[PDB]
Design a protein around this ligand. Structure first.
Ligand SMILES: CCCCCCCCCCCCCCCCCC(=O)OC[C@H](COP(=O)([O-])OCC(O)COP(=O)([O-])OC[C@@H](COC(=O)CCCCCCCCCCCCCCCCC)OC(=O)CCCCCCCCCCCCCCCCC)OC(=O)CCCCCCCCCCCCCCCCC
Ligand SMILES: CCCCCCCCCCCCCC(=O)SCCNC(=O)CCNC(=O)[C@@H](O)C(C)(C)COP(=O)(O)O
Ligand code: SF4
Ligand code: SF4
Ligand code: SF4
Ligand code: SF4
Ligand code: FES
Ligand SMILES: [K+]
Ligand SMILES: [Zn+2]
Lengths: 176, 48, 126, 96, 360, 114, 95, 263, 208, 113
């Protein structure tokens, strides 16, 4: 249940002494290293052609946030504030009121994407699958406040990426 | 597709030269892919 | 020997690095917190608390968030007895007021009182 | 995997190994990106009978720490545990 | 040329992690541990999971324990690739960095397939893991491990027999075993100096008593024997991963105490008790009984321990984080005496230091 | 009331340590203005040292002033050895802060703080 | 259905619009105010009321575990339709 | 004096005659779970959540109504007491609706909290639930009667403290419905305290409805000024904005109630 | 209680109880409490005059041989007049066991430095100084280790706020990173999460 | 058999382990005789030192002595003997068999508070 790395006594016979001296003078392990580097010179490199080629992702991927809807147009979020209760960065700010037909809905739904740690506790705490964390990771901005999403930005991300988020949740939800 | 290429090279997109008004002949962008192809291209699915 | 006799008052205000503004203008409040009347549980009324007076919360111009400049707004301390909290507040130079523990008085419950003969404590339904 | 046999033999000679049996680039040997839907099993507490929570309550069988000594003969000296058994040298590859 | 005194100034990445833990729940405190040793993510997840599960007096299911050991040894391969390749890269050997990070890219694809994030998974939780293995993942872990021995072989071909690599590491950073024990060293910093100690063997956790692996023991306590110990730990991690892929049991992946681990989303939307438990876990959290533990594991840098204190509430009272790199970077001042400034970078290499876990 | 001392048995040994620490800071201020290449004068830094000493001059506990001398020696060790930068030396001089309202009337005019 | 203030600024589905004299409209100067144009209150009112022949109906929103928690709606009021508290779909007992 | 000696989990405690088992357990610092019991109302005994074991007695007793006898050893953490609590919580959560996200009482719910503390963790109810018609008893008290557990604190409050005699149970069995039986508007001066002493979300505050959530609210302990009684209140604020006004218990002013104007 | 309850180890519980008796009767001058938790960990709650005797005993004695100081910790509990709780986590490689040595001090009473016993303590109690303000007498280089150089106060004290009192930004007037009093654009929202119902009856404290 | 290396770095091979352990154990007993007989440290250390010295005197072989002293290599057994000797010389000066120097406060080790 243990092995001794570097506990080899070298053979002091003239054969092995001459082997080590030929290794010292004629640089055997240096040619071994050159041979391994030359072996990688003739391999096909692992380089993908981004932006035209994309890295592999699973349907569990945690990227840009989105607010989803039911298949009727109605938004799924019913203002229950589980996602900001569980949010480990407190990146989520929610205010709420009954809207004009008496429905429990949000008026504020902020996510500071510069506080967000992209751990997906909000999408796993949401009882109605409203807040999700979509596949989008290519949403770098040029200004700090462009990464401070309100409800309109997240509903537009949901309406933007719904045709993909729905299929990711379809592929993954039985593991949940 | 070229499934003889290794995993990562076997799917790609040759972007358009005009999308939503912008001349994207040289100014190709990673977020030019619509969401229905963003599963297939990122290998979230085997099905286009 | 190896022990010195310090007959002064225990004051560590110059060691804690708290600015003078947040020592000499803050009113600590030593209190047992009231029971949430939404609930009947009394485990949140067991220990003493020390919170400070609420300072200004204003609207963020960008997002509408509640900005603040008070560091001691979220500082809620937990003590076991009243005297430990009072010693801790006198130790740090904090001006404090102390509310007393409000325990409920023992009630006289009788299920037979709901069905009395000549008393007004009869129920009209059960 | 598209390398021609001259470069393939040169590469296997310069590395000293057979590099085509173990390619670090992945090909059709990997699993599908689209899988059939799973059917995950349930735990042992998914029973309709003999399943009271008090008989399987882990958090409520934690006791306060037992006070051994507090300030309110010829007995054998003890250790915190018996002494550690000496490890055996590896039968698989001891480097000896 | 010589070095007379080496004073490391740290705290440049001190973020006050273990004060932010004090104001957050246990599920909220879990992703702070991914960010401590950010090349050893699920190992620190597993250490905090074991600390909370020791305080809760519950245990994970067996499949979750085997998944924890599988991804812990994948994490060990990640950390030893980072250690060996950046230790060779700071000395000047820049090529096996690029060689081994493609395999490291594939293990981050394993993390992304199992959790959705490539590094900070928040996956190993108190009570088990968050989510079961997706179908086809273990086949790709097999396809990785079947080839990774040749990768370790060609890394070891480039560095181990090389005379220039042996000149930079053999007389360098020698630690005696008594001073290694006295300075709080752990892991490869003890095993290079000949100390037969490994926390997966002596104080075994989840299912490490059911796997079979060897423990590499150095003989001179230098940079070179610790390099060889990390290479052989990659070998033995491949061995453990083959044993975990062969001996993976079926079953559930969370503890079936729904007052601790949250119920499934199919039965949260159906059952009433399950909806109440989903609510109260993802808002308040499970209460942990009072009492303090010190739960330490064998992280790939050494002993990663959590001294976690609960007061009965749903949030920790004090969560001290013992990290190997703190004691190792403390011992840096002794270990660089009599050596030159070019040996100091090799000694900072052989003590694998991630300053997140040193500074918190 | 018998407590264990830190370095000083009474207040006079404590005043000796405060006095030697003040001597050391007074000797250090010209070197601090020189090698940190500060835009202040030596007299201004010495008045700041006098101000930071007179801030804590109301303490009659030997252990508290022992810890004050210890923390002052730590700040001095961070100043003699170049561990602080120019920013850490100039944080004693609150230059980028607007002057606070002092009387009742301006504090009334600007806000709610007493 | 998004409408427009007298200042020219669109009103969100909350009802939020800045005043004319509110200085914070300068953040949209040279830029745009991103509102969403699919109002949920205008789209759940497009769904028909389901005529069911029971006294108590259940609603999960559809999709099974892809919807909301399954709630049970009473339909004894003949004046008012029974609206689901999650999805907004409303039901009427046909008799 | 005439204090009798009773035992709570083996620990001796001296109680006045006429003390209930729940008050005997309160005097040693142990709070028995309850839903219908309230120490300012009368005793109903109709939720069976306080069912505690007296040893050498082969039947659990309702601790809210049972007077103590001399020599009883009250077993509050025994096997059959815990089985009684888990079974009664199972029947309470049988027909109860899955409204915990869309319910205002979530996070401040007694049913949630002592389901977490004393109930089981999963359902065996493989049936369809009931659904109760919601009532309109005023512009203050939102009424969602599917969430009602029929604890009859409504009725005891309106009969004994509010002095109204207009709330009550109509029907019988599982179809028993707390209400007024008519489209009647419960407007007393104290009509908002049934929001307090509803342990579930069947009676919420209609102005406070959907606006906040109790764990994010900062509790400020203040005084009423709407009258000269000086009712001690809680002003719960969220991010610098007053969300609602709850009472404070004070035994000499406002026992635990406030008026509708204050609230 | 088989699948979801942690399996209790009564053998290690009995062995740690016997060794706790052993340490308590070898060193009655300083040992105050000895307690073993239900998950089988040993605590030796001592007096702060016996840091060096108890630790040197556990380091050197042939039935202890706790050669490795794993972790050294302070715990701030403000309701005590000795508010800090200095925790010594030790490891014996010979007997494959862990002991915990706990002592106490307030802000002003110094603790003796244990760098003469464990050289690992050199940075740990330096960190305890930096984070809590516990001074350590006869320390070689006692100073801060984690905070900023001009930092005022000790952060892991529980009367210290979550955010500090100062925050930094670059100021272009003075061409310098400056320290200004902290103003959060969004306040840290304190959540009141504690349930009002008692969770664990075994930990029930007796009332007044 | 002349063990070539101890395996531990910085731990030299002791050529005469039996005589060294006998000298160290009798020296531990000679130092430990300066401690009062009612002290538990003296009784327990005399017990374990007489056990180990009986094992060393009753075993000619070196490797069997290592397997039945049960302390690893014989040189770290010698190291622990030197550590016990230095410990006893410290325990004379500390006098830790005395009664408790100070009682703690009444809620000093109470958890949770
Ligand atoms: C030495 C000089 C070069 C001799 C030719 C050579 O070695 O070609 C590579 C050729 C193929 O190498 P490989 O990388 O193993 O082929 C796999 C490719 O994926 C197979 O290639 P492919 O399937 O990707 O086919 C497309 C590829 C086809 O590749 C080629 O045409 C190779 C370039 C030939 C020049 O063509 C391109 O990608 C266009 C490249 C255009 C520029 C080529 C360089 C021009 C240099 C002068 C300006 O090598 C051999 O056939 C063996 C060596 C022959 C030496 C002959 C004596 C000299
Ligand atoms: C360039 C900027 C560098 C800034 C340097 C900051 C230095 C900070 C050092 C702070 C050290 C102290 O505050 S220790 C002083 C506390 N001493 C006391 O409380 C005792 C009272 N002290 C006195 O009365 C002092 O005036 C004397 C000199 C000791 C005696 O005066 P009285 O007699 O008449
Ligand atoms: S992913 Fe995590 S940090 Fe980001 S908003 Fe969701 S819960 Fe908060
Ligand atoms: S958890 Fe879901 S439904 Fe609840 S407030 Fe958040 S997004 Fe809305
Ligand atoms: S009354 Fe309580 S248990 Fe019922 S839906 Fe509301 S929060 Fe949930
Ligand atoms: S509505 Fe509430 S207070 Fe009234 S009987 Fe039902 S549960 Fe009790
Ligand atoms: S509390 Fe006694 S039965 Fe309701
Ligand atoms: K209510
Ligand atoms: Zn619905």
């Amino acid at each position: 249940t243990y092995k001794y790395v570097n506990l080899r006594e070298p053979s002091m016979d003239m054969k092995s002494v001459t082997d080590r001296a030929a290794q010292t003078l004629l640089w055997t392990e240096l040619i071994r290293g050159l041979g391994m580097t030359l072996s990688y010179l003739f391999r096909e490199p692992a380089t993908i052609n981004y932006p035209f080629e994309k890295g592999p992702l699973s349907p569990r991927f945690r990227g840009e946030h989105a607010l989803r809807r039911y298949p009727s147009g109605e938004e799924r979020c019913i203002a229950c504030k589980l996602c900001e209760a569980v949010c480990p960065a407190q990146a989520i700010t929610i205010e709420a009121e009954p809207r004009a037909d008496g429905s429990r809905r949000t008026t504020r739904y902020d996510i500071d994407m510069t506080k967000c740690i992209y751990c997906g506790f909000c999408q796993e705490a949401c009882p109605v699958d409203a807040i999700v964390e979509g596949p989008n990771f290519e949403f770098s901005t040029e200004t700090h406040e462009e990464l401070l999403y309100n409800k309109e930005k997240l509903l537009n991300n949901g309406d933007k990426w719904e045709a993909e988020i729905a299929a990711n949740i379809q592929a993954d939800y039985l593991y949940r | 597709e070229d499934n003889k290429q290794f995993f990562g090279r076997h799917r790609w997109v040759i972007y358009t030269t005009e999308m939503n008004g912008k001349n994207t002949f040289w100014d190709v962008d990673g977020s030019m892919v619509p969401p229905e192809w963003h599963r297939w291209l990122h290998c979230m699915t085997d099905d286009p | 020997t190896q022990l010195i006799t310090v007959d002064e008052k225990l004051d560590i205000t110059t060691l804690t690095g708290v600015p003078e503004e947040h020592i000499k203008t803050r009113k600590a409040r030593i209190f047992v917190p009231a029971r949430n009347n939404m609930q009947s549980g009394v485990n949140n009324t067991k220990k003493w608390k020390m919170e400070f007076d609420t300072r200004e919360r204003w609207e963020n111009p960008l997002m509408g968030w509640a900005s603040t400049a008070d560091p001691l707004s979220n500082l809620v301390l937990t003590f076991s007895t009243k005297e430990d909290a009072i010693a801790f507040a006198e130790k740090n130079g904090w001006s404090y007021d102390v509310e007393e523990r409000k325990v409920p008085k023992p009630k006289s419950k009788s299920y037979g009182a709901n069905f009395s003969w000549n008393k007004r404590t009869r129920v009209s339904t059960k | 995997a598209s390398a021609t046999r001259l470069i393939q033999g040169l590469r296997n000679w310069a590395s000293g190994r057979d590099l085509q049996a173990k390619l670090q680039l992945r090909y059709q040997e990997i699993s599908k990106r689209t899988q059939p839907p799973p059917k995950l099993p349930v735990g042992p507490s998914h029973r309709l009978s003999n399943n009271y929570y008090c008989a399987r309550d882990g958090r409520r069988e934690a006791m306060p720490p037992s006070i051994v000594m507090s300030s309110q003969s010829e007995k054998k000296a003890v250790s915190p545990a018996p002494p550690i058994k000496r490890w055996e040298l590896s039968q698989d590859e001891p480097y000896l | 040329e010589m070095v007379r005194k080496c004073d490391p100034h740290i705290g440049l990445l001190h973020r006050g992690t273990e004060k932010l833990i004090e104001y957050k729940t246990y599920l909220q405190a879990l992703p702070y541990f991914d960010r401590l040793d950010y090349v050893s993510m699920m190992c620190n997840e597993q250490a905090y999971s074991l600390a909370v599960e020791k305080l809760l007096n519950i245990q994970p299911p067996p499949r979750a324990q085997w998944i924890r050991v599988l991804f812990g040894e994948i994490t060990r391969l990640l950390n030893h690739i980072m250690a060996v390749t950046t230790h060779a890269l700071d000395i000047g050997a820049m090529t096996p960095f690029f060689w081994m990070f493609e395999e490291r890219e594939k293990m981050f694809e394993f993390y992304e397939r199992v959790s959705g994030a490539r590094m900070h998974a928040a996956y190993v939780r108190p009570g088990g893991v968050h989510q079961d293995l997706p179908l086809g993942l273990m086949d790709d872990i097999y396809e990785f491990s079947k080839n990774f021995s040749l990768r370790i072989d060609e890394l070891e071909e480039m560095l181990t027999n090389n005379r220039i690599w042996r000149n930079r590491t053999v007389d360098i950073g020698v630690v005696t075993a008594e001073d290694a024990l006295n300075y709080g060293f752990s892991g490869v910093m003890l095993r290079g100096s000949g100390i037969q100690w490994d926390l997966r063997k002596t104080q075994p956790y989840d299912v490490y008593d059911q796997v079979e692996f060897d423990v590499p023991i150095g003989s001179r306590g230098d940079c070179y024997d610790r390099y060889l110990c990390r290479v052989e730990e990659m070998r033995q991690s491949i061995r453990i991963i083959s044993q975990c892929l062969n001996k993976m049991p079926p079953g559930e992946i969370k503890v079936d105490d729904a007052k601790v681990s949250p119920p499934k989303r199919a039965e949260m939307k159906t059952s009433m008790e399950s909806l109440i438990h989903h609510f109260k876990l993802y808002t308040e959290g499970y209460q942990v009984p009072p009492g303090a533990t010190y739960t330490a594991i064998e992280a790939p840098k050494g002993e990663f321990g959590v001294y976690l204190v609960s007061d009965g509430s749903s949030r920790p009272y004090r969560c001290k984080i013992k990290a190997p790199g703190f004691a190792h970077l403390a011992g840096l001042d002794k270990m660089s005496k009599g050596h030159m400034l070019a040996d100091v970078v090799a000694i900072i290499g052989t003590q694998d230091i991630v300053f997140g876990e040193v500074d918190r | 009331t018998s407590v264990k001392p830190i370095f000083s048995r009474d207040m006079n040994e404590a005043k000796r340590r405060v006095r030697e620490l003040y001597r050391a800071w007074y000797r250090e201020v010209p070197n601090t203005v020189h090698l940190f290449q500060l835009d202040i004068s030596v007299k201004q830094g010495r008045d700041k040292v006098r101000e930071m000493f007179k801030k804590n001059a109301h303490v009659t506990d030997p252990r508290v002033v022992d810890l004050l001398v210890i923390k002052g020696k730590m700040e001095l060790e961070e100043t003699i050895n170049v561990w602080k930068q120019r920013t850490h030396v100039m944080r004693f001089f609150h230059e980028t802060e607007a002057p606070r309202p002092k009387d009742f009337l301006s504090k009334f005019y600007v806000g709610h703080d007493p | 259905g998004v409408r427009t203030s007298p200042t020219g600024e669109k009103v969100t589905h909350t009802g939020q619009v800045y005043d004319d004299e509110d200085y914070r409209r300068v953040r949209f100067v040279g830029r745009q105010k991103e509102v969403n144009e699919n109002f949920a209150i205008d789209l759940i009112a497009e769904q028909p009321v389901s005529q069911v022949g029971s006294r108590v109906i259940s609603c999960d929103g559809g999709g099974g575990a892809l919807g909301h928690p399954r709630v049970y709606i009473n339909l004894d009021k003949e004046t008012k339709t029974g609206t689901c508290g999650y999805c907004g779909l409303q039901f009427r007992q046909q008799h | 004096s005439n204090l009798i000696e009773v035992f709570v989990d083996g620990q001796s405690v001296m109680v006045e005659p006429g003390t209930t088992v729940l008050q005997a357990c309160e005097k040693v610092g142990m709070q028995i779970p309850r839903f219908c019991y309230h120490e300012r109302l009368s005793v109903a005994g109709n939720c069976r959540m306080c069912l505690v074991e007296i040893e050498k007695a082969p039947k659990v007793v309702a601790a809210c109504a049972m007077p103590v006898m001399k020599g009883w050893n009250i077993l509050t953490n025994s096997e059959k007491t815990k089985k009684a609590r888990e079974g009664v919580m199972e029947f309470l959560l049988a027909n109860h609706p899955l409204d915990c996200p869309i319910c205002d009482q979530g996070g401040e719910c007694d049913l949630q909290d002592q389901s977490m503390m004393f109930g089981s963790d999963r359902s065996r109810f493989l049936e369809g639930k009931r659904a109760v018609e919601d009532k309109n008893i005023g512009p203050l008290v939102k009424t969602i009667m599917t969430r009602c557990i029929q604890c009859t604190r409504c009725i005891r409050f309106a009969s004994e403290i509010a002095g109204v005699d207009d709330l009550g149970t109509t029907g019988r069995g599982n179809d028993m419905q707390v209400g007024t039986y008519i489209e009647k508007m419960f407007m007393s001066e104290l009509s908002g305290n049934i929001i307090d002493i509803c342990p579930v979300g069947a009676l919420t505050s209609k102005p406070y409805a959907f606006t906040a959530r109790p764990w994010e609210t900062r509790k400020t302990e203040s005084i009423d000024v709407m009258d000269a009684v000086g009712s001690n209140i809680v002003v719960s604020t969220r991010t610098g904005e007053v969300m609602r006004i709850l009472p404070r218990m004070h035994e000499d002013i406002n026992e635990e109630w406030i008026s509708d104007k204050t609230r | 209680t088989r699948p979801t309850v942690r399996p209790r180890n009564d053998v290690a519980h009995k062995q740690l109880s016997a060794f706790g008796e052993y340490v308590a009767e070898i060193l009655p001058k300083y040992v105050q409490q000895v307690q073993v938790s239900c998950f089988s960990e040993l605590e030796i709650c001592i007096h702060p005059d016996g840091v060096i005797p108890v630790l040197t005993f556990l380091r050197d004695h042939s039935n202890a041989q706790f050669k490795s100081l794993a972790d050294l910790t302070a715990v701030d509990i403000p309701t005590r007049q000795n508010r800090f709780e200095i925790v010594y986590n030790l490891l014996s490689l010979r007997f494959n066991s862990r002991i915990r040595v706990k002592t106490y001090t307030d802000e002003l009473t110094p603790v003796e430095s244990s760098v003469s016993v464990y050289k690992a303590a050199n940075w740990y109690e330096r960190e305890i100084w930096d984070m809590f303000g516990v001074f350590f007498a006869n320390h070689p280089d006692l100073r801060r280790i984690l905070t900023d150089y001009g930092f005022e106060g000790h952060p892991f004290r529980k009367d210290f706020p979550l955010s500090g009192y100062v925050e930094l930004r670059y100021d272009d007037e003075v061409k310098r990173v400056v320290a200004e009093p902290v103003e959060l654009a969004q306040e840290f929202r304190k959540f009141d999460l504690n349930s009002p119902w008692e969770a664990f009856p075994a930990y029930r404290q007796p009332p007044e | 058999l002349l063990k070539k290396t101890t395996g531990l770095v910085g731990l030299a091979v002791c050529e005469t382990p039996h005589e060294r352990l006998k000298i160290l154990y009798t020296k531990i007993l000679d130092v430990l005789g300066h401690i009062p007989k009612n002290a538990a440290y003296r009784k327990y250390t005399e017990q374990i030192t007489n056990e180990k010295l009986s094992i060393v005197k009753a075993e000619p072989d070196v490797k069997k002595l290592e397997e039945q002293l049960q302390g690893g290599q014989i040189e770290e057994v010698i190291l622990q003997a030197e550590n016990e000797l230095s410990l006893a010389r410290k325990m004379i000066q500390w006098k830790p068999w005395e009664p408790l120097v100070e009682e703690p406060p009444a809620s000093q080790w109470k958890w949770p508070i």
